[PDB]
Design a protein that fits this description.
heterodimer; A: HIV Type 1 Reverse Transcriptase, Chain A, domain 1; Alpha-Beta Plaits; 5 domains; 5-stranded mixed sheet; 13 helices; B: HIV Type 1 Reverse Transcriptase, Chain A, domain 1; 14 strands; elongated; binds a molecule of 2 linked components (GLC-FRU); DNA-binding; DNA recombination (chain A); transferase (chain A); RNA-directed DNA polymerase activity (chain A); endonuclease (chain A)
Chain lengths: 552, 406
DNA sequence: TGCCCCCCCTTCGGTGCTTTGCACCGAAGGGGGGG
């Protein structure tokens, strides 16, 4: 137990402590919980209480490991709901690509970090639990915590912030010693030669012990490779601890969920990982035990991933005297993969971006989002933004930010010829086309009936009306544009009265969750020239009036 | 000194907003700034048992290379009790918008000499991040009137008027308006002379304990019709739909004469000759468009709204209103950076200029409707912010159905 | 039969529009990883 001052905590206003009865348990668990708590009582982590304390939270018994030694955990779900909110100070996860090369490295853990931090004295009575007796022979043995319980909502933050306050004197005294503190795990690097470095280490251990934090020897790593945060720290490079993917004859939804999660974890260092086709399997499913047959595309993607994973890979460490460089490749179906490096073929890390934001988008927008994801990740890890290498031409980007009405930007980037390139798949003419037919399109739906029509008239005297079933207003308007593109030549002028349809199409999308919009896109890509114009409806205007006419 | 008792508005809790990532140079500056205010007792280290948080970052103004800490108290200010209800409030003076020049002074540090209600401090918590999450976040809360908090100009009102009094009755026709942590001070003297009344005002405040605007050049952009010798069906269609939109704003705008020249199913490129009755409609509409709209008056009890459109070639149109289509001001902001290659920087600068004009004119900033994706804005805007205040904003995706303002 | 954090992918439900469905966005469901 630390002599650090306790952090005052409160229940939420209006609420009392938990009063949850003890779910009965085996005479065996009963006696192991007796064993566990007599040793905690002699260490002062808990103390006996009686019936005058009215609170309770169930104590259940768990096998600690393969050895069969019993482990006690307390189900503070109910007390957690009644305890005040906290502001968590763990803002993120350190990444080994953010580390600089060091001469001397040490990895230490503190032992029973939680059970070494005292708990606010006035709050302890709410952590009361009861060990029951077989068949109610006795009332049972009640205890309460004097230290941070595992399973209480506030324990991780109070242990973390207590550790920060204890490390702070030592950190200020030695600014040339890097201490990464994650919960009870400490990485300590320096450029002092191992003799002076190990002096400072046991000095640090002694500081911790005066404040009640042991550092057991079995957790004191003195030699590379170091096991840290799921990685392996060698002097020149780093490593993920081995990734084992599920292998199944028959896959459940849950199996697939576990597979995608492993592949996303692997994607931080293994370039080119894809999960679009495997995650498609999760869609529309309705039970975690539902067996899902792999599609053909999913088997191929899994095999592609497995080939990548059998090759060994490593990341390098960060050299602050060189630029950060981020290179992106396009993978298809809205998937992007990236590497971040400082010297060529020496990746600090990798990643993937594959989210579809919006019902309708294009590759240029998604490239801009990938840049934004990488820019944020780079500030988290290295505190700065990388120079970019992108498979898009300057002419392409310039054509995009001059004809798109939203402000958009991407920082310093070099073009790199890495097919497939990102490109605009069509561009609407900014002026009407001489010699091209003019289509006046309209579509209307009856909100109550689900029925509608889409149609057009032209300056060449052509006209057409299609009946539509189970449709909407906005669909008939898209439908009307679909007809005009379908029946027109390579150059066309189209006048619509739907601001909605104009809005989607003028954004030059190249993919959509709408099949109707996807159909319009494939026709736009096949035209030579398209001018698309809006007019207000029901003002008896030009051709728009007669096509509206024709709709009814 | 004894504090002023402060409340949140009924049924509202303190801010609970996550800290966003920060560059190396901004974190270093915040740690330098805050450990020094720790030492001066202006803030105090706290822990996670305080459940409130407000983001913080830093800014370098382009001609002061010191860093300035900026806490984003927008959430806290919205939940804070009105001081106007409690009688403490800063009357906006008209006739600041008519001064030759107006300079902006950052005066937020005057607040650091007044303590804050012991029971309100917990709502002012913020957290400094760390690069690569080497440490957990470091949390502080204020013991004094915080910068950027709307309550600090109000609690400090009594005092600043006493600080300013000799200067203002020794200078009756200067006008001084306090907005948040800023002092907007304008008058008609020559810039060389105007500026040293600034620097004299500077020392007077320093011894008890900026940008250079010109309101007269803030011209309005009215909606304009094109002029040509000849007109196509497409030209007339565009014109008709643009005056039809303008009919929700102005009064007695007609499109029936120009409408029926497009009678029939015509080609877009066919040139339609103007009837003289249609030149009649267009000359008439053209100058209803000329002069401002009758019947539009500012209301102090309702919010200000600002809309912005990217027009291209560095240009940006904007409209400030309170009810839809009743514009108090329409304008056009222009780049001058000389770079010409960064849309996000231009929009961030446009927002600061438009909000500055609203402070000068009406005394408060508008809630902006920004023509940009949320995530593109949040990727970059703090790189270009220079104001000690931050306006409300929201993100819109409205394609141009008209090029109404161009 | 417990806690806290970051990530991705899917699903759901609230909001506002001068809408009647649509697009957006944040929260919560699963998974990965850390302690
Ligand atoms: O950009 C919006 C984004 O910013 C946050 C703070 O991180 O909210 C701020 O901006 C809003 C718009 O003005 C305010 O309403 C809010 O009070 C302010 O904190 C996020 O909450 C929001 O997602």
């Amino acid at each position: 137990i630390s002599p650090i001052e306790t952090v005052p905590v409160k229940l939420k206003p209006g609420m009392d402590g938990p009063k949850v009865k003890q779910w009965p348990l085996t005479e065996e668990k009963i006696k192991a919980l007796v064993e566990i708590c007599t040793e905690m009582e002699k260490e002062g982590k808990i103390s006996k209480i009686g019936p005058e304390n009215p609170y309770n939270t169930p104590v259940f018994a768990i096998k600690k490991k393969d050895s069969t030694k019993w482990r006690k955990l307390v189900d503070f779900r109910e007390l957690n709901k009644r305890t005040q909110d906290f502001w968590e100070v763990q803002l993120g996860i350190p990444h080994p690509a953010g580390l600089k090369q060091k001469k001397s490295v040490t990895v230490l853990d503190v032992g029973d970090a939680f059970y070494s931090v005292p708990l606010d004295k006035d709050f302890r009575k709410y952590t009361a639990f009861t060990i029951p007796s077989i068949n109610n022979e006795t009332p049972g043995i009640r205890y309460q915590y004097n230290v941070l319980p595992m399973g209480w909502k506030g324990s991780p933050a109070i242990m973390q912030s207590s550790m920060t306050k204890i490390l702070e004197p030592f950190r200020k005294q030695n600014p040339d010693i890097v201490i990464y503190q994650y919960v009870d795990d400490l990485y300590v690097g320096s450029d002092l030669e191992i003799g002076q470095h190990r002096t400072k280490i046991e000095e640090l251990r002694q500081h911790l012990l005066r404040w009640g934090f042991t550092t057991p020897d079995k957790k004191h790593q003195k030699e590379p490779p170091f096991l840290w945060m799921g990685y392996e720290l060698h002097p020149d490079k780093w490593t993920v601890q081995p990734i084992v993917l599920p292998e199944k004859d028959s896959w459940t939804v849950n199996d697939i969920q576990k597979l995608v999660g492993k592949l996303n974890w692997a994607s931080q260092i293994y370039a080119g990982i894809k999960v679009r086709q495997l995650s498609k399997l999760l869609r529309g499913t309705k039970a975690l035990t539902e067996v899902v047959p792999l599609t053909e595309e999913a088997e191929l993607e899994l095999a592609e991933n497995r080939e990548i994973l059998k090759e060994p890979v490593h990341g390098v460490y960060y050299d602050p005297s060189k630029d950060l460089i981020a290179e992106i490749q396009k993978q298809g179906q809205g998937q992007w993969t990236y590497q971040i490096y400082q010297e060529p073929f020496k990746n600090l890390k990798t990643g993937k971006y594959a989210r579809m934001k919006g019902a309708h988008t294009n590759d240029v927008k998604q490239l801009t989002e990938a840049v934004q994801k990488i820019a944020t990740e780079s500030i988290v890890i290295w505190g700065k933004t990388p120079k970019f290498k992108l498979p898009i031409q300057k002419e392409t980007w310039e054509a995009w930010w001059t004809e798109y009405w939203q402000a958009t930007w991407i920082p310093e980037w070099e073009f790199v010829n890495t097919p497939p390139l990102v490109k605009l798949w069509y561009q609407l003419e900014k002026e009407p086309i001489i010699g091209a037919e003019t289509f006046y399109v309209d579509g209307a739906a009856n909100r109550e009936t689900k029925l509608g029509k889409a149609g057009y008239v032209t300056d060449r005297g052509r006209q057409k009306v299609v009946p539509l079933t189970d449709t909407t207003n906005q669909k008939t308007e898209l439908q009307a544009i679909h007809l005009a593109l379908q029946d027109s030549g390579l150059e066309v002028n189209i006048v619509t009265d739907s601001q909605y349809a104009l809005g989607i199409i003028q954004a030059q999308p190249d993919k959509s969750e709408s099949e109707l919009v996807s159909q319009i896109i494939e026709q736009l890509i096949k035209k030579e020239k398209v001018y698309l114009a809006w007019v207000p409806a029901h003002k008896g205007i030009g051709g728009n009036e007669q096509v509206d006419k024709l709709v009814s | 000194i004894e504090t002023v008792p402060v409340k949140l508005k009924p049924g509202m809790d303190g801010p609970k907003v996550k800290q966003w990532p920060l560059t190396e140079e901004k974190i270093k500056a915040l740690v330098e700034i805050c450990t020094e205010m720790e030492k001066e007792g202006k803030i105090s280290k706290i822990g996670p048992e305080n459940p409130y948080n407000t983001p913080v970052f830093a800014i370098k103004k382009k001609d002061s290379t010191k860093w300035r800490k900026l806490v984003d108290f927008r959430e806290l200010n919205k939940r804070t009790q009105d001081f106007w209800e409690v009688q403490l409030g800063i009357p906006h003076p008209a006739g600041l918008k008519q001064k030759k020049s107006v300079t902006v002074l950052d005066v937020g540090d005057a607040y650091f000499s007044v303590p804050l209600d012991k029971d309100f401090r917990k709502y002012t918590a913020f957290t400094i991040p760390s690069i690569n999450n080497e440490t957990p976040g470091i949390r502080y809360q204020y013991n004094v009137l915080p910068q950027g908090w709307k309550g600090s100009p109000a609690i400090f009102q009594s005092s600043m008027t006493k600080i300013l009094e000799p200067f203002r009755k020794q200078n009756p026709d200067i006008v001084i308006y306090q907005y948040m942590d800023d002092l907007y001070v304008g008058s008609d003297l020559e810039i060389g002379q105007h500026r040293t009344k600034i620097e004299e005002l500077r020392q007077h405040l320093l011894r008890w304990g900026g940008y250079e605007l010109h309101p007269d050049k803030w011209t309005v952009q009215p909606i304009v019709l094109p002029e040509k010798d000849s007109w196509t069906v497409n030209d007339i269609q565009k014109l008709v739909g643009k005056l039809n939109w303008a009919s929700q704003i102005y009064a007695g705008i007609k499109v029936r004469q120009l409408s029926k020249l497009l009678r029939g199913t015509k080609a877009l490129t066919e040139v339609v000759p103007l009837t003289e009755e249609a030149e009649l409609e267009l000359a008439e509409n053209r100058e209803i468009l000329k002069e401002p709209v009758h019947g539009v008056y500012y209301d102090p009890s309702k919010d200000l709204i600002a809309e912005i459109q990217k027009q291209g070639q560095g240009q940006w149109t904007y409209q400030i209103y309170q009810e839809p289509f009743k514009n108090l001001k329409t304008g056009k902001y222009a780049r001058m950076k000389g770079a010409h290659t960064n849309d996000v920087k231009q929009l961030t600068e446009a927002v600061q200029k438009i909000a500055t004009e609203s402070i000068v004119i009406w005394g408060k900033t508008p809630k902006f409707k920004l023509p940009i994706q949320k995530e593109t804005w949040e990727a970059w805007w703090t790189e270009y912010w220079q104001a000690t205040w931050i306006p409300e904003w929201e993100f819109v995706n409205t394609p141009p159905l008209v090029k109404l303002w161009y």
